[PDB]
A paper describes a structure:
Focused classification, signal subtraction of the MukF core, and focused refinement using neural-network-based regularization with Blush resolved a 73 kDa region of MukE bound to gp5.9. As observed previously in its RecBCD-bound form, gp5.9 formed a parallel coiled-coil dimer complemented by a β sheet of the N-terminal strands. gp5.9 bound along the DNA-binding cleft of MukE, overlapping along its full length with the DNA capture site. However, the orientation of gp5.9 with respect to the DNA molecule is broadly similar, in the sense that the long axis of the gp5.9 coiled coil aligns approximately with that of the double helix. Moreover, within the resolution limits of the structures, gp5.9 positioned several negatively charged residues (D11, D15, D21, E24, E36, D38, E43, and E45) near positively charged residues in MukE (R140, K150, R163, R164, and R179) or MukF (R322). Most of these ion pair interactions mimic DNA phosphate backbone contacts and thus prevent the natural DNA substrate from binding efficiently. Therefore, although there are significant differences in the details of binding to individual targets, the data overall support the designation of gp5.9 as a DNA mimic protein. The structure revealed that binding of gp5.9 to the MukE DNA-binding cleft is mutually exclusive with formation of the DNA capture state. We find that gp5.9 targets the DNA-binding site of MukE, which contacts DNA both in the capture state and when DNA is entrapped in the clamp compartment. Although gp5.9 targets DNA-binding sites by contacting residues involved in phosphate backbone binding, it encodes sufficient specificity to interfere with select targets.
Numbering used by the authors:
A (entry chain E): 9 to 213
B (entry chain F): 7 to 209
C (entry chain I): 4 to 49
D (entry chain J): 3 to 49
E (entry chain C): 191 to 197, 263 to 327
F (entry chain D): 42 to 55, 69 to 79, 89 to 101
The structure:
Amino acid sequence: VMPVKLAQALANPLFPALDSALRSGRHIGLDELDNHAFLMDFQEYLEEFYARYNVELIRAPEGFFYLRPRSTTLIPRSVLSELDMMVGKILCYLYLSPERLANEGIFTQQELYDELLTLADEAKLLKLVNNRSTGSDVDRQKLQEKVRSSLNRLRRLGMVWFMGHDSSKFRITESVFRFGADVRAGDDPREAQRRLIRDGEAMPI
Amino acid sequence: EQVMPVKLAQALANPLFPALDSALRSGRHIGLDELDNHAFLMDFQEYLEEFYARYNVELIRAPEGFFYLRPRSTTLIPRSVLSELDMMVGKILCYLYLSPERLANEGIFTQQELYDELLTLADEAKLLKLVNNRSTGSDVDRQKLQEKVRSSLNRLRRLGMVWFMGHDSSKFRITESVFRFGADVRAGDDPREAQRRLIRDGE
Amino acid sequence: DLVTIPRDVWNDIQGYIDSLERENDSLKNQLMEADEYVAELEEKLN
Amino acid sequence: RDLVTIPRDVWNDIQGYIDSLERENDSLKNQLMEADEYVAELEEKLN
Amino acid sequence: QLLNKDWIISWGQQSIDLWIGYDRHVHKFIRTAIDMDKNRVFAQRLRQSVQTYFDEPWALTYANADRLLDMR
Amino acid sequence: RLDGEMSEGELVDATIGVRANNAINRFTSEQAEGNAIY
């Protein structure tokens, strides 16, 4: 009928919050002590259950959890635009910045924006922002607002915890390591990208 | 605590459940047509009413036999509200289902009839505001209005009120689930009069 | 009748509320200027 | 660690508030995209 | 910088707590990062990938269940 | 003040935000308003 531990866990009053949160994409980091402990105790049976939905449960080596739908899933999937991926990669770097340690892990969006413009080909972001823009102040401000919108979209997924009563700061969680799957392996990024596609991690765009 | 009632587990174990759960949480008005789903719900109604309560959601069976999920202000599952024009289309579909000609047509109607019904029994100015707040009242506006009416009909088909027939989208059949848009007119007067009054009042 | 929440969760909720409010306020002006641009283009075309 | 104690009647308010903001923001996103398509069509008409 | 090279009464109490938090953070960072890329290759590769990213865009996936529809 | 430790908010009260930060340019304390103690 049902495994004993699966039945016992399902009755746990903490379950509904997770069940609704995970199927909306939320990644679970180490911070949420109670939720993470619950998942640790009952990983096997939860994985078995969701596998009936035709969706997969993944625990990457870093220690987080996330839901990955397969081709024939019974719950839809979705992706995110290029700008969000850019912001995610930048966030991934800041986590690793050895000079950052003075900041204890708290950051500010001003640094995020300033750093970003040191890498991306200025126009190649402007075109995604506005074709007519060629470094004007107004379009720079427009991009400044677009990055905030992307960051809110990212937080909803669980990559960053906001802090304090002022939005101009935030904290990064270890779930950002996902954005590095491209460079995880030492082989040519292209074949690795196709391998990721085959595994279902990412779809080409 | 009481970990699990036997019947609750037996119900969750039925192989067909997962699709039903995913559809329900999408709000679909599971009805009689799905004889299997209807039977399964009939067997284990009360216990599924009990379980979903933890989500702060009421599993309500309407008088006419169909089932749908109605959450409260404190839902633990995200909820979204559809646009007004969708509600107008829903009400119009409610009216047609009562037409005596349904038996003659076996319930087969084509999008042209629905579009004409909307246009003739709906205010042109309100619709022109709906289609585009900058609309000039020209034809292109009416063509885009037809396009969005088609899109809304598709969304409603996703809700499960109506069925597409064969492999051509031009033919569809209505089911008894449409009353969710007519339960407000449950009074014993003429359905036409009640719907006309509601539409005149803007309700 | 009383709910207890960890300090971190409440802080996160408040920060997110403020961020969302600021984003919405900004986007309002964004739409306003876009519509004004459309209106100006239409007026100049005529 | 530290905790905050709150009554339900107050807690429910912020939960409603954030959801309303999210829905309004998404609707505005859609309307802005539609306006963008219109302006693009006008621009290609002009040129 | 060392890592970069190679891979009245109440005030005292508060400063002590801040220092303890600092040490906790440095321990967390060492555990999470240095073991993973003990040879620093990961960060350089990420730098270059972002720099040459536009040559082949791509996007990853995340489950997004459809929201519940409701009326007024 | 009896606390003996000032937070960033008090300083900013004393492009407003950006100019203030540039003027400032420290002990982080997440539990303090603004998460900064000087």
